Design a protein around this ligand. Sequence first.
Ligand SMILES: CCOC(=O)N1CCOCC1
Length: 119
Amino acid sequence: YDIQAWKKQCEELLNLIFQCEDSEPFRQPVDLLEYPDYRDIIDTPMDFATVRETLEAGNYESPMELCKDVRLIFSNSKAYTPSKRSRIYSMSLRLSAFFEEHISSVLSDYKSALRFHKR
Ligand SMILES: CCOC(=O)N1CCOCC1
């Protein structure tokens, strides 16, 4: 029932994601010199360094907000991919599966702690 525990749990999950080779295309903002039309397709860029910095700045109130930004990294990859078989998009799918598998208990524990707090 610790309402604050999600933050360190998210820091540790971000550390695992940064060690994962599949996260390399998503660690920093997409380079517009490499992908000149990126902002014509993607309205809201997102990357894991921005998520980590937002968390460390104390600018997430809950793990649901962090989860919405991580999911935006994956939906941006899906929206920008020219093919469902592209290398970078395939890396995003594996990374998304790993993220979803690990964030599920973080979200459940937070929501349970908050319900206990408001009982
Ligand atoms: C295949 C889809 O492409 C992406 O997801 N990108 C990762 C971020 O930088 C641009 C390329």
